Write a protein that holds these residues in place. Structure first.
Motif, PDB file in Angstrom:
ATOM      1  N   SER A   1      -4.702   2.196  -0.821  1.00  0.00           N
ATOM      2  CA  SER A   1      -4.143   3.912  -1.335  1.00  0.00           C
ATOM      3  C   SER A   1      -5.012   3.909  -2.066  1.00  0.00           C
ATOM      4  CB  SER A   1      -2.955   2.560  -2.414  1.00  0.00           C
ATOM      5  OG  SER A   1      -3.418   2.698  -3.841  1.00  0.00           O
ATOM      6  N   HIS A   2      -6.406   3.449  -2.463  1.00  0.00           N
ATOM      7  CA  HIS A   2      -6.993   4.800  -2.984  1.00  0.00           C
ATOM      8  C   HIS A   2      -7.793   5.470  -2.067  1.00  0.00           C
ATOM      9  CE1 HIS A   2      -9.835   6.155  -5.797  1.00  0.00           C
ATOM     10  NE2 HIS A   2     -10.857   5.558  -5.604  1.00  0.00           N
ATOM     11  N   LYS A   3      -8.331   4.977  -1.558  1.00  0.00           N
ATOM     12  CA  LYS A   3      -9.132   5.565   0.211  1.00  0.00           C
ATOM     13  C   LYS A   3      -7.782   6.217   0.701  1.00  0.00           C
ATOM     14  CE  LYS A   3     -12.685   2.818  -1.173  1.00  0.00           C
ATOM     15  NZ  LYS A   3     -13.565   3.685  -1.390  1.00  0.00           N
ATOM     16  N   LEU A   4      -6.881   6.018   1.020  1.00  0.00           N
ATOM     17  CA  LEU A   4      -5.860   7.112   1.924  1.00  0.00           C
ATOM     18  C   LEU A   4      -5.264   8.125   1.249  1.00  0.00           C
ATOM     19  CD1 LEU A   4      -3.429   4.726   2.869  1.00  0.00           C
ATOM     20  CD2 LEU A   4      -4.276   5.377   4.135  1.00  0.00           C
ATOM     21  N   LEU A   5      -5.729   7.968  -0.195  1.00  0.00           N
ATOM     22  CA  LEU A   5      -5.377   8.986  -1.055  1.00  0.00           C
ATOM     23  C   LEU A   5      -6.606  10.121  -1.178  1.00  0.00           C
ATOM     24  CD1 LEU A   5      -3.332   7.573  -4.006  1.00  0.00           C
ATOM     25  CD2 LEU A   5      -2.832   9.305  -2.275  1.00  0.00           C
ATOM     26  N   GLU A   6      -8.161   9.263  -0.859  1.00  0.00           N
ATOM     27  CA  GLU A   6      -9.020   9.964  -0.939  1.00  0.00           C
ATOM     28  C   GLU A   6      -9.586  10.737   0.683  1.00  0.00           C
ATOM     29  OE1 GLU A   6     -11.991   6.973  -1.689  1.00  0.00           O
ATOM     30  OE2 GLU A   6     -12.378   8.073  -3.226  1.00  0.00           O
ATOM     31  N   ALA A   7      -8.842  10.000   1.744  1.00  0.00           N
ATOM     32  CA  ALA A   7      -8.622  11.123   2.517  1.00  0.00           C
ATOM     33  C   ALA A   7      -7.579  12.105   3.006  1.00  0.00           C
ATOM     34  CB  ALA A   7      -8.405   9.752   3.504  1.00  0.00           C
TER      35      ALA A   7
ATOM     36  N   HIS B   1     -15.742  -3.689  -3.447  1.00  0.00           N
ATOM     37  CA  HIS B   1     -14.650  -3.393  -4.216  1.00  0.00           C
ATOM     38  C   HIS B   1     -14.960  -4.813  -4.428  1.00  0.00           C
ATOM     39  CE1 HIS B   1     -14.777   0.370  -2.126  1.00  0.00           C
ATOM     40  NE2 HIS B   1     -14.180   0.681  -3.479  1.00  0.00           N
ATOM     41  N   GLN B   2     -15.102  -5.383  -5.973  1.00  0.00           N
ATOM     42  CA  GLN B   2     -14.921  -6.368  -6.513  1.00  0.00           C
ATOM     43  C   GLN B   2     -13.261  -6.797  -7.325  1.00  0.00           C
ATOM     44  OE1 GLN B   2     -17.017  -4.395  -7.349  1.00  0.00           O
ATOM     45  NE2 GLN B   2     -18.608  -5.151  -5.813  1.00  0.00           N
ATOM     46  N   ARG B   3     -12.274  -7.793  -7.108  1.00  0.00           N
ATOM     47  CA  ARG B   3     -11.577  -8.570  -7.203  1.00  0.00           C
ATOM     48  C   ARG B   3     -10.506  -7.244  -7.671  1.00  0.00           C
ATOM     49  NH1 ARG B   3     -10.209 -11.091 -13.891  1.00  0.00           N
ATOM     50  NH2 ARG B   3      -8.964  -9.641 -13.095  1.00  0.00           N
ATOM     51  N   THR B   4     -10.053  -6.633  -6.688  1.00  0.00           N
ATOM     52  CA  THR B   4      -9.909  -5.149  -6.270  1.00  0.00           C
ATOM     53  C   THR B   4      -8.530  -5.598  -5.389  1.00  0.00           C
ATOM     54  OG1 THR B   4     -10.848  -3.770  -7.181  1.00  0.00           O
ATOM     55  CG2 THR B   4      -9.185  -3.239  -6.887  1.00  0.00           C
ATOM     56  N   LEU B   5      -7.177  -5.792  -5.610  1.00  0.00           N
ATOM     57  CA  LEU B   5      -6.522  -6.142  -4.316  1.00  0.00           C
ATOM     58  C   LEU B   5      -6.552  -5.020  -2.684  1.00  0.00           C
ATOM     59  CD1 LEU B   5      -3.649  -8.093  -5.998  1.00  0.00           C
ATOM     60  CD2 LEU B   5      -5.033  -8.954  -5.267  1.00  0.00           C
ATOM     61  N   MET B   6      -6.239  -6.127  -1.320  1.00  0.00           N
ATOM     62  CA  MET B   6      -5.977  -5.308  -1.027  1.00  0.00           C
ATOM     63  C   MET B   6      -4.882  -3.196  -1.078  1.00  0.00           C
ATOM     64  SD  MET B   6      -7.943  -4.164   1.837  1.00  0.00           S
ATOM     65  CE  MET B   6      -7.432  -3.432   4.076  1.00  0.00           C
ATOM     66  N   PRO B   7      -3.748  -3.417  -0.886  1.00  0.00           N
ATOM     67  CA  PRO B   7      -2.728  -2.978  -1.736  1.00  0.00           C
ATOM     68  C   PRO B   7      -3.715  -1.594  -2.415  1.00  0.00           C
ATOM     69  CG  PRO B   7      -1.634  -4.671  -1.878  1.00  0.00           C
ATOM     70  CD  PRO B   7      -3.484  -4.915  -1.957  1.00  0.00           C
TER      71      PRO B   7
ATOM     72  N   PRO C   1       4.646   8.788   1.690  1.00  0.00           N
ATOM     73  CA  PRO C   1       3.772   7.805   2.087  1.00  0.00           C
ATOM     74  C   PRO C   1       2.949   8.009   3.489  1.00  0.00           C
ATOM     75  CG  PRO C   1       5.782   6.365   1.829  1.00  0.00           C
ATOM     76  CD  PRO C   1       5.761   8.100   0.989  1.00  0.00           C
ATOM     77  N   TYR C   2       4.711   7.852   3.912  1.00  0.00           N
ATOM     78  CA  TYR C   2       4.055   8.344   5.940  1.00  0.00           C
ATOM     79  C   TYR C   2       3.415   9.407   6.895  1.00  0.00           C
ATOM     80  CZ  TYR C   2       7.839   4.268   5.244  1.00  0.00           C
ATOM     81  OH  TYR C   2       8.657   3.593   4.637  1.00  0.00           O
ATOM     82  N   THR C   3       3.859  10.722   5.944  1.00  0.00           N
ATOM     83  CA  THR C   3       2.962  11.482   6.742  1.00  0.00           C
ATOM     84  C   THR C   3       1.737  12.051   4.902  1.00  0.00           C
ATOM     85  OG1 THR C   3       5.161  13.371   5.373  1.00  0.00           O
ATOM     86  CG2 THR C   3       3.360  14.351   5.373  1.00  0.00           C
ATOM     87  N   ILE C   4       1.062  11.326   3.877  1.00  0.00           N
ATOM     88  CA  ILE C   4       0.172  10.939   3.479  1.00  0.00           C
ATOM     89  C   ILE C   4      -0.632  10.109   4.734  1.00  0.00           C
ATOM     90  CG2 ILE C   4      -0.364  10.048   1.662  1.00  0.00           C
ATOM     91  CD1 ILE C   4       1.165  10.660  -0.158  1.00  0.00           C
ATOM     92  N   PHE C   5      -0.173   8.928   4.805  1.00  0.00           N
ATOM     93  CA  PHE C   5      -0.948   7.974   5.806  1.00  0.00           C
ATOM     94  C   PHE C   5      -1.078   8.109   6.758  1.00  0.00           C
ATOM     95  CE2 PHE C   5      -1.106   4.575   8.814  1.00  0.00           C
ATOM     96  CZ  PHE C   5      -1.921   3.882   8.559  1.00  0.00           C
ATOM     97  N   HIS C   6      -0.526   9.218   7.935  1.00  0.00           N
ATOM     98  CA  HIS C   6      -1.035  10.191   8.929  1.00  0.00           C
ATOM     99  C   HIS C   6      -1.768  10.982   8.751  1.00  0.00           C
ATOM    100  CE1 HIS C   6       3.254   8.361  10.637  1.00  0.00           C
ATOM    101  NE2 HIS C   6       2.694   7.974  11.465  1.00  0.00           N
TER     102      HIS C   6
ATOM    103  N   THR D   1       0.523  -1.731   0.767  1.00  0.00           N
ATOM    104  CA  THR D   1      -0.386  -0.023   0.155  1.00  0.00           C
ATOM    105  C   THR D   1       0.933   1.769  -0.333  1.00  0.00           C
ATOM    106  OG1 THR D   1      -2.088  -1.066   1.035  1.00  0.00           O
ATOM    107  CG2 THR D   1      -1.710   1.015   1.531  1.00  0.00           C
ATOM    108  N   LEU D   2       2.164   1.488   0.774  1.00  0.00           N
ATOM    109  CA  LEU D   2       2.927   2.523   0.380  1.00  0.00           C
ATOM    110  C   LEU D   2       3.374   2.719  -0.593  1.00  0.00           C
ATOM    111  CD1 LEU D   2       4.425   2.198   4.729  1.00  0.00           C
ATOM    112  CD2 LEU D   2       3.038   3.500   3.386  1.00  0.00           C
ATOM    113  N   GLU D   3       4.130   1.138  -0.934  1.00  0.00           N
ATOM    114  CA  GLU D   3       4.610   1.566  -2.498  1.00  0.00           C
ATOM    115  C   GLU D   3       3.444   2.478  -3.401  1.00  0.00           C
ATOM    116  OE1 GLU D   3       6.493  -1.526  -3.693  1.00  0.00           O
ATOM    117  OE2 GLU D   3       6.815  -1.416  -5.519  1.00  0.00           O
ATOM    118  N   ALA D   4       2.613   1.418  -3.449  1.00  0.00           N
ATOM    119  CA  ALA D   4       1.337   2.124  -4.225  1.00  0.00           C
ATOM    120  C   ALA D   4       1.084   3.567  -4.055  1.00  0.00           C
ATOM    121  CB  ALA D   4      -0.082   1.346  -3.843  1.00  0.00           C
TER     122      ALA D   4
END
Ligand SMILES: [Mg+2]
Ligand SMILES: [Mg+2]
Ligand SMILES: [Mg+2]
Ligand SMILES: [Mg+2]
Lengths: 132, 23, 195, 150, 304, 129
Positions: free
Chosen positions: C162-168, C152-158, C107-112, C80-83
Motif C-alpha cells: 500500500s505504501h509503495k502504491l501510494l508513493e507511485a 523493510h523489516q517486520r512490516t507485512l506485505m499489505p 483503490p482500483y484507480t489508484i492501483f492502475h 492491500t486494497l483495503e489498506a
RNA sequence: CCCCACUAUGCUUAGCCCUAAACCUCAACAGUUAAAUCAACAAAACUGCUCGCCAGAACACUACGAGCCACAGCUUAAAACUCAAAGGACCUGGCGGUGCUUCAUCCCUCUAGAGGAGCCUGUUCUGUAAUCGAUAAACCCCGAUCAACCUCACCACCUCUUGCUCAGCCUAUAUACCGCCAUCUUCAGCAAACCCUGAUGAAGGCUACAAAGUAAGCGCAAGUACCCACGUAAAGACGUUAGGUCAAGGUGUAGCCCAUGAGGUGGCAAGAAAUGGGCUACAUUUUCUACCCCAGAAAACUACGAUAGCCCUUAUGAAACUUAAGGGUCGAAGGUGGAUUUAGC
C-alpha cells in the motif's frame, strides 16, 4: 536400443512365427500370454510356485520333444488340472508321439501331483507370420 | 590446374639466383 | 496441452453476447456463425463475468503467488486494497474542503494509475523500445520485487505494498526511481543504438 | 536463385522507372523518392530517408502503393504486393530517439586459472605429506581361393 | 486368386451355417452382427487391438480389396487405366473432371474431408500426399462450383461427419427442475436447479458460503448464473465428492451450468457454451514418469 | 494435358488403354516388378504427343524401344522420330488435328475388332459343317 | 602492410638489352559437317598437306661448349648419382580464418533452483590387514527396489579335500559373445530386390500444371494403453561410441585343482579434506496453537534456524553408542549466496 524379446531384421529372409514377430510391448495388445493361471490376480497366492512350475514344464517339454515343437507351449490351469497345449511338426512317426505323450503326462502328473493333460496339434511346417 | 611445376621452377630459379649472388 | 488445437479460448464478456444483431457487421456476423461451430475451452477458474473482476489485479495476484498459494496471494491483494482505501479515507477526512476534491479514494484507480506511472517506456547492451505487455510486466515485477525487499523489516506485505502504491500514485517511491534509472541508462547508451 | 535475383533487379528497375516518370503521379514525381533496395519473397522495397518530409514521403508512398501495384500489373503482370520500408539508417536509433524525447526522466589477466592450479598443487603436496598401416588396395582376399577349393 | 476367393466364400457360408447351428439360431437369418457376437462369446479375447481379436467375417472384408490379378486368362487388363499403376485414383480423377466439364456445359458445417488413409482404403491403392492434395483441390473446386444433386452425392462419398459436441423433471410436489452432472479433475458433482427459486444453493446439504469459505469458489459458483443474469432466481441443490476445494467448485459450476441450460433460451445456451461454461475441462494431473522428478521436470543434469 | 480427358475417353470407348498421366519410372522396363511377373506388356503403343512437358522426348518412346514394343506416333516438326516405329508427321497441338487422329485410331481399332469377331464367327460356323 | 618526404625509374633524343602466364595456353594453309560426335575437362568432331617440337620423373629456365654491345645476363643445352613412380582430367568424402538462405531453445525474455550454510548420501583422496564395477555428455541416492551378523564377492586367523553338484572358481579377457541397455533418438531414414542415366568410367537417379525411379520389408506414421480425436506413455529402424555389464545368468579362449575351491570365528566402514546430488533453512506470503483458510499470540540474543551433537527410552533383532522412531538437552553455522549452471511451455 531396446533388445528384449525382439527379433531384429537382418536380411528380410529369416522367418518368424506370430509370437516371435511381436515385441514385448504388444503383450495383451496383439498377443496373449503363453500361460494362464490365477496366480497373478489380485489377492491370489502361490504365484512363485506356478512360475517355477511353468518354467520347468517348458524346459522339460522342449527337451522331451527334440525339434518336434513348432512354437511355444500354452499352459492352462483349471482347478488342479494342467493342460499343456503344444504345436508340433509332423516329423516323428505317430507311435513316438503317442509314447512321448503318455510318458510326459504320467511323469508330470506324478511329479506335480496334478492331472496333467497334453494336447498336441500337428502342423506340416513352422508357421511363418512374416520374414525378417 | 595446380602450379606445382611452376612452383618447382620458381624455387629452382630462386636458389640459382641466390647461389649466383653468393659466389 | 490436453486441449486440441481446434479448441478456442473462451470469451467471457456479457456485453459481447447481449449486443444487438443489427449493430453487428457482416464480418462480425460471420465470426459469430463460425464460433457457433468451434469447440471452446472450459472457462478457467480464475476469470469470471463478475463486474468486479479486474484482469490487471488478477495478473498482479498471480505474480504475487508463491508456490500455488492463490488464497494467500488474494488475501494479500485484498488487504492491500483495503489498506490503500483506509489510508486515502483518513487523508480525505483530515483534509480541507478544497483538498477533498483532489484526493482519490478508489483503490482500483489508484492501483492502475500507480502501475501506469511505474511502466518504463524504454528498455535495454543496446536501448530498445518495449512493447505494452513487457511494460506492464516490468511495472508489476518491479513493484513486487521492491515490496519483497529485505530493507523493510517486520512490516507485512499489505502495508508495504500500500505504501509503495501510494508513493507511485504520486510519482515518487523507489519504483519510480528505478524507472528513471532505466531511462537514464538508456539515454546514456543511446550512442550504441546503431547496433 | 539467380532467376530470383534477376526478378528482384527487374522489379527494382520497374519501380525506379515508375518513380522517375511524371505520368504515374504528380505527387510521386515531385517527391523524387529513390530506392535503396528491392527484394521479392510479397515484395519489400527500401528507399533512402532524408522527419516531417520523411513522414510526408512515407504517407504519399502508402497512399500510392495500390496505384503503383495496378500500374505494375500492366507490365511482370503477376506482381505481388509491394511493401515500402523507410530506411532511416538504423530505424531502431530513430525510434529510440523519438521515444527518449517523449520519455520522462523525472527530476535531475594472465590467461590461466592460477588459483585452481595453485589449489591442485597444494592438494598434491598434502597428499604427498608410429606403426605400419597397410594400404587398403593391397589387402588380400581369400574368397577366390575358397571358391576354387570348392 | 479369384478361385481362392470363391473357395473362401463357400467356406464362409458353411461356417456361417455351422455357427448358426452352434448358437441355436436360424441359419437363414443369421446376420453379420450375430456372427460377431457369437465369435466374441465363443472365442473371448481381451487384446486391446480389435483387429487382433478373432474374426470370421465375409471373405470380401477379410481379404484385401486389391483383388487378384487385374487381367483375365488372355492377360488383357480389365480397366483401361491399368497401366497408370493407379487405375482407381486416375479413374476417379477422370470422372471428377468429366463432372466439371458437364458443370461447365450446363452453366462445411457437419462434414470434413476424409484423410489420405481413408481415401487409400476407399481405392485400395497407395497414394502420395501431393496426389491427395490434388484430389482434394479438385473436389473443393467441384463443391465451390454450382454443384448439382449428383455432384453433392459424389462429394458426400468423401464427406466425413465432424465430431461436434435437455430434460426437465418434476418432483413429488410439482416443482419443475433439471438435473445434471459434471466432472473436474477428480471431483464429481451432481446438481439440481429448480425452475423457480430465490437464489439458495445447498452443497452437500450445507449452504455454499459455509461450505466454500474461499471467495474464489463462491465466484466460480456465481459465474454461470451471473452470465445469464439469473442470480437470485433459481434454487440449487448439489452434491460434490472427491478432489479439493477448487476441483469441487469447478465440478459444481459445470453441473450447474449444464442443468441451467434446460431453462435459459437456446441463444443463451449457445452464449454459455461460447463462454466455456459447458465444456468439461480435460486438464487433469499428468502422471510422473520414471527417471524424472515429476510429470515434466527432469532430474538435475549433474554438473560437469 | 489439354487432350488427356479426350484421349482417355477415346481409349476407354475403343476398348484399349490410355496413359496420359505422369509416366512413372520403369512402368515398362520394370513392369514385372510393378505389376507382377505375369503382367502382359502392350503389343503396340500410340503416341499422340511424343514430347513431355519439358519438350524432351517422352521416356516411353525409349522404354518401348527397349522392350521391343512397336510405336505408332504423331511427330511434329520439333519431335524426334528416330526410335518411333511408325512415325506420322503431323500437327499435334491443334485440337482439330488431335481430334482427327483420335477419330481415325478409334475407327481403325473398332473396325479391326469387329472384323475379327466376324471372321471368328464365320470360321467357327463353317468349321462345324 | 599504413602515412609523409624523396631517388633510380615511368617521359623525350640516340644506342643497347631481346625477356613474359609474349596465353585464343588452339602452329600455317586447304577442306568437311557425313560417319564413330567424343577418354575427361577446355573450346563441336575431323580430314589433307607442310614446318617446328616431344619420347618417365627429378637433376635442369642447371653444368660445360659456343654465340651475343649482353659481364649477378640471354639463346642453345646435357650427364652422373637417385626414384617407381612423376603427371593430366574427373568422381566421392573431409575440410574452408567458405558464400547465401532458413532454423533451434544457441542468446535475450519467464518461474523456481544449484554455485554461500548445516545435514543426508554418492564419488575422489588419505588412512586401514581389508572388495568389485560405473566413472565427458551417456559415472557420481550408479549395479543396491538398499551392507550391524548374513548379505559378501574384502581382510586376518583357523579348518576341509571326490567336496551341495557325473566337482568347483565373483580367476584373466565386455577388445570373443549371448542376454539387457545407454547415446544421437527432443531423429526418418535404413537395407535388400529391381529399373534407368552417364558411349555400360568412378558415379548418378529431383521438379506435382512433375522431367526415372520403384512393387515389397524395417522405422517413423497408423493402431493401442491412460481420460478424447489432444496430451503423456509406449514405440523409436539401420548405424555411431571395440559405450556398460565375464560380479544377474549362460558361454568361447586362457588359468587354478592340498586351492585362485569349500567352511567357521572375528574385523573395516576414520576425516586433515575436495566434489556431485538431495533435504532443511536463512523467516513476516514468516513462526506457534486452534482450525483446515473471517482467530489469538510470536517476531533478533529467551527470534527464525539441525532430520547435527550429547543423554535416556522404545521398535526390530540372538546381537543396536551402530539401524530406525520418540523424548530430553543443546539453539550451532547461517541472514537469499560470484562467475557460471539445472529444469520447465
Ligand atoms: Mg630444386
Ligand atoms: Mg507440337
Ligand atoms: Mg599479351
Ligand atoms: Mg609455322
Amino acid at each position: 536400443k531396446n533388445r528384449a524379446a525382439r527379433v531384429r531384421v537382418s536380411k528380410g529372409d529369416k522367418p518368424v512365427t506370430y509370437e516371435e514377430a511381436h515385441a514385448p510391448h504388444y503383450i495383451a495388445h496383439r498377443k496373449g500370454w503363453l500361460s494362464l493361471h490365477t496366480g497373478n490376480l489380485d489377492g491370489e497366492d502361490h504365484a512363485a510356485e506356478r512360475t517355477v512350475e511353468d518354467v520347468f514344464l517348458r524346459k522339460f517339454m522342449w527337451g522331451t520333444f527334440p525339434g518336434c515343437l513348432a512354437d511355444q507351449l500354452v499352459l492352462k490351469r483349471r482347478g488342479n488340472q494342467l493342460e499343456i497345449c503344444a504345436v508340433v511338426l509332423r516329423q516323428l512317426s505317430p507311435h513316438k508321439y503317442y509314447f512321448l505323450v503318455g510318458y510326459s503326462e504320467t511323469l508330470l502328473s506324478y511329479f506335480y501331483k496334478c492331472p496333467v493333460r497334453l494336447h498336441l496339434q500337428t502342423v506340416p511346417s513352422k508357421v511363418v507370420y512374416k520374414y525378417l | 590446374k595446380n602450379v606445382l611445376k611452376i612452383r618447382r621452377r620458381k624455387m629452382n630459379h630462386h636458389k640459382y639466383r641466390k647461389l649466383v649472388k653468393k659466389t | 496441452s490436453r486441449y486440441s488445437p481446434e479448441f478456442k479460448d473462451p470469451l467471457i464478456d456479457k456485453e459481447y453476447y447481449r449486443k444487438p444483431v443489427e449493430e453487428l457487421t457482416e464480418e462480425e456476423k460471420y465470426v459469430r456463425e463460425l464460433k457457433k461451430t468451434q469447440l471452446i475451452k472450459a472457462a478457467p477458474a480464475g476469470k469470471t463475468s463478475s463486474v468486479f473482476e479486474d484482469p490487471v489485479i488478477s495478473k498482479f495476484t498471480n505474480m504475487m503467488m508463491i508456490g500455488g498459494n492463490k488464497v494467500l496471494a488474494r488475501s494479500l491483494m485484498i488487504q492491500t486494497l483495503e489498506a490503500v482505501k483506509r489510508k486515502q479515507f483518513e487523508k480525505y477526512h483530515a483534509a480541507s474542503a478544497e483538498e477533498q476534491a483532489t484526493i482519490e479514494r478508489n483503490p482500483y484507480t489508484i492501483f492502475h494509475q500507480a502501475l501506469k506511472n511505474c511502466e518504463p517506456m524504454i528498455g535495454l547492451q543496446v536501448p530498445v523500445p518495449l512493447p505494452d505487455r513487457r511494460r506492464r510486466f516490468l511495472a508489476m515485477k518491479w513493484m513486487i520485487t521492491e515490496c519483497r525487499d529485505k530493507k523493510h523489516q517486520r512490516t507485512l506485505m499489505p502495508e508495504k505494498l500500500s505504501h509503495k502504491l501510494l508513493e507511485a500514485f504520486h510519482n515518487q517511491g523507489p519504483v519510480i526511481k528505478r524507472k528513471h534509472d532505466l531511462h537514464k541508462m538508456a539515454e546514456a547508451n543511446r550512442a550504441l543504438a546503431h547496433y | 536463385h539467380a532467376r530470383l535475383r534477376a526478378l528482384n533487379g527487374l522489379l527494382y528497375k520497374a519501380l525506379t522507372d515508375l518513380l522517375c516518370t511524371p505520368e504515374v503521379s504528380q505527387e510521386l514525381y515531385d517527391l523524387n523518392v529513390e530506392l535503396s533496395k528491392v527484394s521479392l519473397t510479397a515484395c519489400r522495397a527500401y528507399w533512402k530517408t532524408t522527419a516531417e518530409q520523411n513522414a510526408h514521403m512515407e504517407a504519399v508512398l502508402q497512399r500510392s502503393a495500390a496505384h503503383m501495384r495496378h500500374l505494375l500489373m500492366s507490365q511482370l503482370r503477376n506482381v505481388p504486393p509491394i511493401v515500402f520500408v523507410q530506411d532511416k539508417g538504423n530505424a531502431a536509433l530513430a525510434e529510440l530517439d523519438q521515444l527518449l524525447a517523449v520519455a520522462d526522466f523525472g527530476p535531475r589477466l594472465c590467461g590461466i586459472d592460477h588459483e585452481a592450479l595453485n589449489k591442485q598443487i597444494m592438494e598434491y603436496k598434502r597428499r604427498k605429506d608410429g606403426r605400419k598401416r597397410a594400404k587398403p588396395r593391397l589387402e588380400q582376399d581369400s574368397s577366390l581361393k575358397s571358391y576354387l577349393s570348392g | 486368386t479369384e478361385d481362392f476367393i470363391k473357395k473362401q466364400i463357400e467356406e464362409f457360408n458353411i461356417g456361417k451355417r455351422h455357427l448358426a447351428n452352434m448358437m441355436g439360431e436360424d441359419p437363414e437369418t443369421f446376420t453379420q452382427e450375430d456372427i460377431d457376437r457369437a465369435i466374441a462369446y465363443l472365442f473371448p479375447s481381451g487384446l486391446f487391438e480389435k483387429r487382433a481379436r478373432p474374426v470370421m467375417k465375409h471373405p470380401e472384408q477379410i481379404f484385401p480389396r486389391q483383388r487378384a490379378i487385374q487381367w483375365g486368362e488372355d492377360g488383357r487388363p480389365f480397366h483401361y487405366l491399368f497401366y497408370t499403376g493407379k487405375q482407381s485414383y486416375y479413374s476417379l480423377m477422370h470422372d471428377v473432371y468429366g463432372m466439371l466439364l458437364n458443370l461447365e456445359k450446363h452453366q462445411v458445417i457437419g462434414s470434413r474431408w476424409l484423410i489420405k488413409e481413408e481415401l487409400e482404403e476407399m481405392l485400395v491403392e497407395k497414394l502420395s500426399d501431393l496426389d491427395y492434395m490434388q484430389f482434394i483441390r479438385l473436389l473443393e473446386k467441384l463443391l465451390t462450383s454450382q454443384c448439382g444433386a449428383a455432384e453433392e452425392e459424389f462429394v458426400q462419398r468423401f464427406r466425413r461427419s465432424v465430431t461436434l459436441e435437455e430434460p426437465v423433471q418434476y418432483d413429488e410436489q410439482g416443482m419443475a427442475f433439471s438435473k445434471s452432472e459434471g466432472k473436474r479433475k477428480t471431483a464429481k458433482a451432481e446438481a439440481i436447479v429448480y425452475k423457480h427459486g430465490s437464489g439458495r444453493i445447498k452443497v452437500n446439504g450445507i449452504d455454499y458460503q459455509l461450505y466454500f469459505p474461499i471467495t474464489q469458489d463462491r465466484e466460480q459458483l456465481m459465474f454461470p448464473f451471473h452470465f445469464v443474469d439469473r442470480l437470485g432466481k433459481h434454487d440449487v441443490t448439489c452434491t460434490v465428492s472427491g478432489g479439493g476445494r477448487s476441483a469441487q467448485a469447478g465440478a459444481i459450476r459445470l453441473a450447474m451450468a449444464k442443468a441451467l441450460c434446460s431453462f435459459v433460451t437456446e441463444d443463451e445456451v449457445e452464449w454459455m457454451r461460447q463462454a466455456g461454461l459447458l465444456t468439461t475441462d480435460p486438464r487433469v494431473r499428468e502422471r510422473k514418469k520414471p527417471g524424472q522428478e515429476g510429470a515434466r521436470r527432469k532430474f538435475t543434469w549433474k554438473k560437469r | 494435358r489439354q487432350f488427356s480427358y479426350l484421349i482417355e475417353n477415346m481409349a476407354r470407348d475403343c476398348g484399349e488403354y490410355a496413359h496420359t498421366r505422369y509416366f512413372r519410372g520403369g512402368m515398362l522396363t520394370n513392369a514385372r516388378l510393378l505389376f507382377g511377373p505375369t503382367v502382359r506388356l502392350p503389343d503396340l503403343i500410340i503416341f499422340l504427343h511424343t514430347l513431355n512437358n519439358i519438350f524432351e522426348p517422352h521416356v516411353a518412346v525409349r522404354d518401348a524401344a527397349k522392350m521391343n514394343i512397336p510405336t505408332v506416333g504423331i511427330v511434329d516438326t520439333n519431335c524426334n522420330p528416330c526410335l518411333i516405329t511408325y512415325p506420322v508427321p503431323g500437327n499435334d497441338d491443334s485440337p482439330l488435328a488431335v481430334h482427327l487422329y483420335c477419330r481415325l485410331f478409334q475407327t481403325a481399332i473398332t473396325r479391326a475388332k469387329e472384323k475379327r469377331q466376324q471372321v471368328e464367327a464365320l470360321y467357327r460356323l463353317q468349321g462345324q459343317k
